[PDB]
Ligand binder design. Structure first.
Ligand code: PQQ
Ligand code: NA
Ligand code: NA
Length: 298
């Protein structure tokens, strides 16, 4: 038949809808078999993608644009409009981004992470502040940062959205999302920065498997939005034995299901991208002059 290899992170949310696709036979319904490939982290996943070891991974539009500008035929399809969480201790003095000055701030994904680019752009626009000049920045994978924020070695951490529900149950508050930043910028609607990244070669030679997987994913998300009972089936993959954590993860996932046409998604991405590569012409590191051509999957 046709096998589609999806690379997934152990702390990621893509494994949730992948389990729905398999359980409900939404891959079979689309003429393919989904093979979930477990990758240990984003660095390994990006290499697996560069090495052609998977047909797709989940990633961000800014990384996708960078691979496209670097010559790759990668295509992007919206995965979620829920992205990023700046977590501070409950009761923290920190009410604004200026309060990060002097703080040990964890930043998931490194200096070029999309959530960090957004947050740095916001701090420059609203306070004329370069967070890298005032905060003690510690980059790292989200699990490590969340643990060290819990242990008190970090004063704050910019993490993936799922880590909010988890930390709220342990004494932490989400001060700001990447979605909050893009609304402050003025985006027309919910912007999907997180998407499926499809291998150019798979798009060219197995385009119907790509479309079959895209349909299977949309059907899985639709099932989770329409069938509350299905969430209890996928709970083991969510690391959510705590009830408030399980409920918050569901709420934030549902709020992020993409529900706008690709044309509108593309135009918002184009404008937010063009607004990032600015901030007093700071040519923010990680951001190219413009999006590479034909990045979005039709
Ligand atoms: O910024 C975010 O909140 C966020 C969330 C998630 C997610 O939903 O797991 C991913 C990412 N970012 C991300 O950048 C990424 O590459 C990624 C991969 C996966 C996955 O499940 O395999 N999730 C995510
Ligand atoms: Na590619
Ligand atoms: Na379908």
């Amino acid at each position: 038949g046709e096998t589609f290899r999806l690379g997934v992170l152990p702390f990621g949310t893509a494994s949730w809808e992948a389990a729905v696709i398999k359980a409900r036979g939404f891959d079979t319904a689309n003429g393919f078999t989904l093979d979930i490939v477990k990758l240990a982290g984003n660095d390994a996943a990006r290499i697996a993608f560069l090495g052609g070891q998977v047909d797709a991974i989940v990633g961000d539009l800014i990384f996708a644009a960078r691979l496209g500008n670097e010559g790759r035929g990668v295509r992007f399809s919206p995965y979620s409009t829920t992205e990023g969480a700046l977590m501070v201790p409950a009761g923290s003095p920190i009410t604004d981004l200026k309060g990060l000055a002097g703080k040990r701030l964890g930043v998931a994904g490194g200096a070029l992470d999309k959530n960090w680019i957004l947050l740095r752009a916001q701090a420059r626009e609203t306070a004329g502040l370069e967070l890298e000049n005032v905060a003690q920045i510690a980059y790292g994978a989200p699990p490590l940062l969340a643990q060290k924020l819990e242990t008190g070695e970090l004063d704050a951490a910019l993490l993936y959205w799922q880590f909010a529900a988890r930390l709220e149950a342990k004494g932490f508050k989400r001060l700001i999302s990447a979605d909050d930043v893009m609304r402050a910028f003025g985006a027309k609607g919910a912007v999907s920065l997180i998407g499926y990244l499809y291998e150019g070669h798979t798009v060219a030679d197995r385009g119907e498997v790509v479309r079959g997987f895209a349909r299977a994913s949309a059907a899985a998300k639709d099932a989770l939005a329409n069938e509350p009972a299905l969430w209890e089936t996928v709970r083991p993959l969510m690391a959510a034995e705590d009830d408030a954590t399980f409920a918050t993860l569901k709420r934030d996932f549902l709020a992020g299901i993409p529900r706008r046409p690709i044309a509108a998604e593309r135009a918002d991405g184009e404008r937010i991208y063009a607004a990032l590569d600015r901030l007093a012409g700071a040519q923010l590191l990680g951001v190219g002059k413009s999006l590479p051509p034909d990045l979005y999957l039709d």
